[PDB]
Amino acid sequence: VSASSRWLEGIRKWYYNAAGFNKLGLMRDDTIHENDDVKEAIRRLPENLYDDRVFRIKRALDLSMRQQILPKEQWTKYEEDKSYLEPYLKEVIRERKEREEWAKK
Amino acid sequence: ANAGDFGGYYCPCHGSHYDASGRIRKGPAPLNLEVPSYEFTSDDMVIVG
Amino acid sequence: GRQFGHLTRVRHVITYSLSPFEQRAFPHYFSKGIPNVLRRTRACILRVAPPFVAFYLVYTWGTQEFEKSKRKNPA
Amino acid sequence: VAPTLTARLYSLLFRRTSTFALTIVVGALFFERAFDQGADAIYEHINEGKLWKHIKHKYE
Amino acid sequence: TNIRKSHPLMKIVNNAFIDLPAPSNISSWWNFGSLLGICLILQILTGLFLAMHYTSDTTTAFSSVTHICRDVNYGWIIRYMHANGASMFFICLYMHVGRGLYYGSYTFLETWNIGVILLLTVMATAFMGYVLPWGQMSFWGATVITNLLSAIPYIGTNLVEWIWGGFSVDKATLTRFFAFHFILPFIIMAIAMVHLLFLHETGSNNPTGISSDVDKIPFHPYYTIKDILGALLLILALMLLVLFAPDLLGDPDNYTPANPLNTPPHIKPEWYFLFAYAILRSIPNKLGGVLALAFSILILALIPLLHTSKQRSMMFRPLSQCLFWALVADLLTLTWIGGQPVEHPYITIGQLASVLYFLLILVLMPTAGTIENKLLKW
Amino acid sequence: MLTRFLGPRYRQLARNWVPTAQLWGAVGAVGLVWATDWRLILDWVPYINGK
């Protein structure tokens, strides 16, 4: 709640800015490494998010190509960073582990 | 000959220090230098082999 | 596998492009060029440089200690 | 005794590719030797041009 | 329809370097694959011409080599392009393995392991290569190294004498190495084709580590020309060495004909092994050192199981970027050490860089990954 | 994260392949032994004492 939470939060906000994907207009979940669980979750995204996600990634690849970056104004502010993919991925993991528990019996 | 901390031998490859008896004292070498089979046939001659 | 036409699904994105025979190969080469490189350097010095100077210091010291260990004064 | 031979041989040693392999390797051991005996023994019998020469020239 | 697409031969070429979908993304660090290819044919091409003159017997070993540079027309550029090409080959090799680690390219299990096999192979190839001119360093570098296997319990002896063709680095030992150094680059090349076969299953990774299917471009004309330009640079580097500083990377000691009783004080392997040499002597044990030296390169195969981050590339991970360059710097220390005598400062600092190399890979990088995840709420 | 392979079924699976994995080691043992004419091991075998 107090100084303590803000400190961790500000340590997190610091790394975020240092990680620097926001400079390419990206979002945390856009940088997630695609594995089986991730592929399925990407698959389950509804039309809108999936479309936005592809354009974001395209904007970035395009930048990373000419090794430019976005104007400061358009970086993605921490806070404002939507974990759109998270709930889907969590459910995909939660599903797999169920098969995995079933496979032990 | 005559190199190393023991006034005997020093092998430069990985730092083997030997003494004047040919024994390993420092470095990675596992055993003492081999003593060949030999005998003295007189005061001036030595036959090794 | 591979092949264009079967990579992935994308919608609603337009891409405007221009013939190379219509544009210049080096637009503002130094004008925008140099600023960028400084920026990239700045972006990475704190992550790249520190280990290298750390080696450098250990290199020059280690060298001095070697040379100066092979002389003797009293004793 | 005859049908049951090939049979037992299949039963105890042939199904499981394990034993099937265990036997051929073990069977290769005994065979390699027994073949080299007979084979050399054959090479000798048709010859005798060297070796019994030894009994003569040395023995000291 | 189009011949390039359907002819049983061109299909290959076409799907390998013409129509192949490639990231719009890949940067200069991606040029090393083609440069490694160029280094390979170059070593094969000059290497061949060198074999049309070099003779493989101790009596003329050194002599033939000299014959090459003085009498054989242009045998000198050929000889030097060869020698320097070997170094260029190692520079690109190390750069290539560098790019892979930084960018997470190793997530391609098979492609990468074939690369480890490519590494040991080009390494084993070059160790034998340098024994050929039968110089002091050749014989001696050949002696130091071969013997290493003599630590393997119950069998090191028998084995070392077996690959020696005697009780020492003799005549048997030179012709042998010529033969293998001739056949290894052909096998390298076939194994490199399987490298590409497997790589082509996924396409290239890229600087962001994010999938690029959404923005793929044809290999020609983009990466044919970006590959052309970068080869010209490799020609610059290569030619700068042979035409200006031909011996810079070479020991002067190998210019003195071998002598089995001599034994130089100086005694080091070629520059491209110094880091591994350092790691080896930093251990006061016969078995230890060798085991550790092996573990030093075979650890490239442990890397994928040590991947811990939720992101593939290191581009967006600074704790890891720092650790990475520490790893580079620590190898540079290892190179430096291995080139120095086993005395004073050098011993203990050499033993520090060693533990570090292993701590950095086996523990520090994996941990930094877990922390960077934690910092992102992942 | 090898916990995925830890449970009753997996334990039954391991027991089922034990005789096979054992026999496959018997094959590799004799296999090396015979192929290198293992002086140490072979001396014990009756009839394979060619010395």
Ligand code: HEM
């Ligand atoms: C015989 C030397 C080698 C040759 C000729 C060779 C050839 C190539 C070529 C032509 C590429 C195309 C894309 C690129 O360069 O990025 C490539 C990529 C790759 N190589 Fe190698 N390689 C060699 C050694 C290695 C080594 C030593 C490793 C690592 C142990 C390695 C693992 C990889 C990986 C993982 C990629 C994928 C790169 C990416 O997409 O980011 N290869 N190689």
Ligand code: HEM
């Ligand atoms: C199959 C093609 C190759 C042939 C025919 C070949 C043949 C030769 C011959 C005859 C020599 C002794 C003459 C001399 O030293 O100038 C030599 C030296 C060498 N080549 Fe190769 N080799 C080939 C591929 C390679 C490869 C793949 C490498 C690894 C990059 C390599 C690196 C070396 C090295 C390190 C030496 C000894 C150093 C020196 O040049 O003095 N060559 N080679």
Ligand code: FES
């Ligand atoms: S060979 Fe003598 S110390 Fe290594």
